[PDB]
């Protein structure tokens, strides 16, 4: 049985992307400090321990699942699109996610808020005419007070409906005070939608929408994600495990149940 690792994860021959201090999801939404991972690509994406978000407090229900779908696709290729928001103020941002000189937010997201006196009943539609699936990512904002709710979106209680021809998610914000994070008792909630060719993404809302900036090109799940604090070395090795590289010469390995590449069976 193979029962020992070098201890390092060899940089060759699979394209290994070290996220350093960004997890995948943070690099995906576009946490200011993961701006470097933009449009990046990999076979194996290793998430370290350091990893800490550092932008608007958010929670992703169905995280581990959304995390895996992206990890598999192995590309982080974002494609901006021409969304048309008429009647609201775009580019919203905050101090909990500073960028440049001040207020910032997730690069891949667009915070809409009222335009002076009002927040119209938004209702855009964007058709997927292409020959590949689209993975839009959006969010809903939950102010922690009815004051905040009204300052930003006017309406006393918002709603976000993101429908395609086969689905229909209608989430409604939930006002209340959550634990303080980077000075905030507020939060955003990340949701997603994959649009199959010949389908139409339809965003209708009248409050709290945290609009998509475009879509993520999705290829076929050949790549994978893995958490490990293993160093990365310059060497050639085919079987990668959270513990490091282990040779695939023996038929059974007992090092770890998680591995990448032509590996010995786990025992």
């Amino acid at each position, epitope marked *: 049985v193979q029962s020992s690792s070098t201890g390092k994860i060899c940089n060759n021959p699979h394209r290994i992307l070290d996220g350093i201090d960004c997890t995948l999801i943070d690099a995906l939404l576009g946490d200011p400090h993961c701006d470097v991972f933009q449009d990046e690509t990999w076979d194996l994406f290793v998430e370290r321990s350091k990893a800490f978000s550092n932008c608007y407090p958010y929670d992703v229900p169905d995280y581990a699942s959304l995390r895996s779908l992206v990890a598999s696709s192995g590309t982080l290729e974002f494609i901006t699109e021409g969304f048309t928001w008429t009647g609201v103020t775009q580019n919203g941002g905050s101090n909990a996610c500073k960028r440049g000189p001040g207020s910032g937010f997730f690069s891949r997201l667009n915070w809409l808020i009222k335009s002076g006196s*009002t927040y119209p009943v938004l209702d855009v539609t964007m058709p997927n005419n292409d020959n590949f699936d689209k993975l839009y990512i959006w969010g809903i904002h939950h102010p922690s007070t009815n004051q905040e709710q009204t300052s930003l979106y006017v309406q006393a209680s918002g709603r976000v409906t993101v429908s395609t021809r086969r689905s229909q998610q209608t989430i409604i914000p939930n006002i209340g005070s959550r634990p303080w994070v980077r000075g905030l008792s507020s939060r955003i909630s990340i949701y997603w939608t994959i649009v199959k060719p010949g389908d139409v993404l339809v965003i209708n809302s009248n409050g709290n929408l945290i609009a998509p900036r475009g879509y993520f090109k999705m290829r076929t799940g050949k790549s994978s994600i893995m958490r490990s604090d293993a160093p990365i070395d310059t060497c050639i090795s085919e079987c990668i495990t959270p513990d490091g590289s282990i040779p695939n010469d023996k038929p059974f390995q007992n090092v770890n149940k998680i591995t990448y590449g032509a590996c010995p069976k786990y025992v």
Partner: antibody
Amino acid sequence: QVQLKESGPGLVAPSQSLSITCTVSGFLLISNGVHWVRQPPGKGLEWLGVIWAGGNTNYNSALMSRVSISKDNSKSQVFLKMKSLQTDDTAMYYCARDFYDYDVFYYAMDYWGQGTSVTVSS
Amino acid sequence: QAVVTQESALTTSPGETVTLTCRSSTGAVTTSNYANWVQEKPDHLFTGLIGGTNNRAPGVPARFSGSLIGDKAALTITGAQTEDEAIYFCALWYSNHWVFGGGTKLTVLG
């Protein structure tokens, strides 16, 4: 950096139509609003109206019947159009950026333009 | 919409602590009004000073402070210097309509 410049006529005769232009740089019109403030010689300032990032506008009740603010988001230009001009309109015309803080929730006029003088004389 | 009123001119000397004020015909000046304090320097080159009543704008020296003093808004130069001579305009927000004050001429006897 933020930056706003006004370019207009300088001299227009009573009963014609005033057309100033505030060309903004370093921020998008879909990200902020732009205000119009006029200062007649030896007087206080006067707020003319505002065009929000959403395009909707809000004018000063008084002059509203003659004012009209617009904008071409793709050119980074806001447009103050005044008709039925009368001598009193001689003043400095300024455009200042509308700012809103998302964390404390307050409005403010942060970036003022350099201004452009307009004399209404026949 | 309403009428913002403030001192015509005020004359201080270097060192002293002056306080321009900003009144509302329509009542007390609440936080709802977002008292804005613009500073007009020579040859009308306006500059933001304080916004939302007390939020000091970046360049603005620490010595300028925004506050509510009773039912009117205020600005307090603490230790005025000759370079504080200027017309200080107060602006009050009333429902998607701004309303400036007459402006105060501040003299700093030098």
